[PDB]
Amino acid sequence: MTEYKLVVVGADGVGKSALTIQLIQNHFVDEYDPTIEDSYRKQVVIDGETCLLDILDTAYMRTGEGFLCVFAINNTKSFEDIHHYREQIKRVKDSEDVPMVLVGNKCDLPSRTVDTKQAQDLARSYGIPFIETSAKTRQGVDDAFYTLVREIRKHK
């Protein structure tokens, strides 16, 4: 077994907490204190390999090995904010090659104001993976966290 320190970042309301709880507790939380910033740990099998994922749900971060950059597809400002978050991540780590994944959450909803090619183009500009998620239906949620872990596995 090996442990992995993941950090979830992004504007408030995008579903950072709902994604972590859905990953950890396999259920959708429609209301979670937006002020609560905590770490949640869980042993998982990723590609036949059992991990311990330690996940800081922001609202410690220096030592994270991988970062989920989350925006909501029904909120362009949260998308416009991604750049600020990637930049601050490179700053905290004093590096430019940090394992990182772009996550478009709430893809269960109509009224999408961020197109898929929009986010894909941004992810390509950063050179990181992009996964569209739904915390409510658990779409792609596993894929998002595992891909980050694969991104970390490549970094080592």
Ligand X SMILES: Nc1nc2c(ncn2[C@@H]2O[C@H](COP(=O)(O)OP(=O)(O)O)[C@@H](O)[C@H]2O)c(=O)[nH]1
**C-beta contacts of 11-15 below 8 A and 24+ residues apart:** 11/71, 11/75, 11/77, 11/78, 11/81, 12/59, 13/72, 13/75, 13/78, 14/70, 14/71, 14/72, 14/75, 14/78, 14/105, 14/106, 15/70, 15/72, 15/105, 15/106, 15/133, 15/135
Question: Which residue, 32 or 40, has its beta carbon nearer to ligand X?
Answer: 32
Q: Which of 103, 128, 134, 152 binds ligand X (CB under 6 A)?
A: 134
Binding segment for ligand X (CB under 6 A), chosen from 26-34, 45-53, 84-92, 95-103, is 26-34
Q: Does 17 bind Mg ion (CB under 5 A)?
A: yes
Q: Does 78 bind Mg ion (CB under 5 A)?
A: no
CB of 2 to ligand X, least distance (A): 27
Q: How crowded is the C-beta side of 71, counted as CA atoms within 13 Å?
A: 26
CB of 15 to ligand X, least distance (A): 3
Q: Does 30 bind ligand X (CB under 6 A)?
A: yes
Residue 5: contacted member of ligand X, Mg ion, none (CB under 5 to 8 Å, by partner type) = none
Q: Does 64 bind ligand X (CB under 6 A)?
A: no
- Spatial distance between the Cα atoms of 93 and 81, rounded to a whole number of angstroms: 19
Q: Does 113 bind ligand X (CB under 6 A)?
A: no
- Spatial distance between the Cα atoms of 136 and 153, rounded to a whole number of angstroms: 28
| Contacts to ligand X by CB under 6 A | 12-18, 30-32, 34, 105-106, 108-109, 134-136
| Contacts to Mg ion by CB under 5 A | 17
